[PDB]
């Protein structure tokens, strides 16, 4: 009754200290990611900064492919998220082998949240100190069209969709900027270029350094091309120049 915060047991206030501490491991590395969705595509931008000039910049990345049509971004303890990515991939593969169809993004997010909740109820397991952001396209009924989808999974196992979201260091400022921009325009009616400009502007305003192209990596899913792929640096450069006006 003295510790009550080293293992997954309730505090007298009805809170889990080991899960709140895993939320601080997300913002500990100092990295930030912003995910947005336009009328026909979904983009995610993650800080990719390499202070060590002897480090191969293209070896380390926070963007992962879960399935050809579902991409992921991990924010927090870098190895931990990697582990979750593996789990996600397995949760895809088994699903593909069980039902014969590719796993929906919402179902994958729900199952990943179920996996996280287990580590918050079993004593010996440590929660993964990362926030997972899955982006993809969802096949709609009664019309057959695809719609962009963002789903975040917390270390507590909380799963939720988003029109736009931010995660990491100074995520509150990015969310405030996105909410302020949302009061005027309608994000679900914008184009890919406008959504990318808004996301990069929010990322810059959260940190206030006017990032370059080598300092960020962007992943993308589109309705025309449902596959998840990373935006080339030239398009990111032109987006940044468009933002700089």
């Amino acid at each position: 009754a003295g510790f009550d915060k080293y293992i997954t047991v309730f505090s007298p206030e009805g809170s889990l200290y080991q899960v709140e501490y895993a939320f601080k491991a997300v913002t500990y590395p100092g990295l930030l990611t912003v995910a947005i969705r336009c009328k026909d595509a979904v983009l995610v931008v993650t800080q990719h900064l390499i202070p060590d000039r002897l480090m191969r910049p293209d070896s380390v990345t926070a963007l992962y492919e879960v399935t050809p049509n579902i991409g992921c971004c991990m924010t927090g303890r870098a190895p931990d998220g990697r582990a979750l990515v593996q789990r996600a991939r397995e949760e895809a593969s088994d699903y593909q082998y069980r039902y014969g169809v590719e796993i929906p993004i919402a179902v994958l997010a729900k199952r990943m949240g179920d996996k996280a909740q287990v580590r918050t109820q079993q004593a010996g397991l440590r929660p993964m100190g990362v926030v997972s952001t899955f982006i993809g396209m969802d096949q709609s009924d009664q019309d057959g069209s695809l719609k962009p989808q963002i789903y975040t999974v917390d270390p507590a196992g909380w799963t939720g969709g988003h029109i736009a979201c931010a995660a990491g260091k100074k995520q509150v400022e990015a969310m405030a900027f996105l909410e302020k921009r949302q009061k005027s325009t309608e994000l679900d009616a914008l184009t890919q270029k406008e959504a990318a400009m808004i996301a990069l502007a929010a990322l810059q305003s959260a940190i206030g350094t006017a990032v370059k192209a080598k300092e960020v990596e962007v992943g993308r899913c589109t309705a025309a091309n449902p596959a998840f792929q990373r935006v080339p640096n030239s398009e990111v450069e032109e987006w940044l120049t468009a933002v700089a006006e």
């Binding site: 510790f3 080293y6 293992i7 004593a123 010996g124």
Partner: protein, 272 residues
């Protein structure tokens, strides 16, 4: 890690198991239920929590299997619980399973003492093995079998059980034991025995004009057989009377409550 292990199934410097004692203390705060074992039936009378105006009754058919305090284990076995109700449900399911397994193996009703013993080993197992907390519940078992007739048993959250002619568990159990000792005899009828139950309950809960919305009563008696069909198995002996467990309703309990409280005035008016 082993640092945070509470070591539930361990001895203390006095040879006493602290988890068992704490479970006993937990049962002390549960609602009081009193069992009286007469010669023509066994009566259980327990105090249930004050009925909130928004409480709803589960519209169950067959309103004789389980009440708010009293449950049926088998056709010839009934029980009342005191303590952690959620712990009591699992043990009730286990007892029903054991009784039906015995009926499966031998095609005869399980003896009351045998059922009491089999569920006491379950409680004892958790105090020596597993490393988890024990069950914080006490059982009052009632029933009838051809070997000893009507019986009454009480179980502790340690595996220990005892047979009683009249007993009580829950709040003010010592006072109930003191009052039951004052007024109990072997030449006692069922309706007299129930009169002893309520009169002891209403005094342990300290009420005059015993409230019908806060008391529940169950009876293990014997009734004439109803579904005896000799033509379907000509070689089976069917007893004339079968044991019946019946939970009293609101309209059935108040005729006996009126006897209890007028008896209360008859016994308190002459003390001057």
């Amino acid at each position: 890690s082993h640092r945070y292990d509470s070591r539930t199934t361990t001895f203390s410097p006095e040879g006493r198991l602290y988890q068992v004692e704490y479970a006993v203390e937990a049962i002390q705060q549960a609602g009081t239920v009193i069992g009286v074992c007469t010669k023509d039936g066994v009566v259980l009378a327990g105090e249930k929590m004050v009925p909130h105006p928004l409480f709803d009754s589960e519209s169950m058919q067959d309103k004789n299997t389980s009440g708010e305090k009293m449950y049926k284990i088998a056709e010839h076995i009934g029980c009342s619980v005191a303590g952690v109700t959620s712990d009591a449900y699992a043990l009730l399911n286990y007892a029903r399973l054991s009784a039906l397994r015995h009926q499966y193996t031998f095609q005869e009703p399980m003896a009351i003492e045998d059922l009491c013993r089999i569920l006491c080993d379950e409680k004892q197992l958790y105090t020596q093995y597993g490393g988890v907390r024990p069950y914080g519940v006490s059982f009052l078992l009632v029933g009838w079998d051809r070997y000893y007739g009507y019986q009454l048993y009480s179980t502790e959250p340690s595996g220990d059980y005892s047979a009683w002619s009249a007993y009580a568990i829950g709040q003010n159990d010592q006072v109930a034991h003191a009052l039951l000792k004052k007024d109990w005899h072997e030449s006692m009828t069922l309706e007299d025995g129930m009169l002893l139950a309520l009169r002891v309950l209403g005094k342990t809960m300290d009420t005059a004009k015993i409230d019908l919305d806060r008391v529940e009563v169950a009876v293990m008696r014997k009734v004439p057989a109803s579904n005896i069909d000799q033509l379907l198995d000509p070689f089976k002996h069917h007893p004339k009377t079968t044991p019946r467990f019946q939970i009293l309703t609101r309209s059935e309990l108040k005729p006996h409550a009126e006897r209890a409280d007028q008896a209360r005035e008859a016994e308190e008016k002459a003390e001057a």
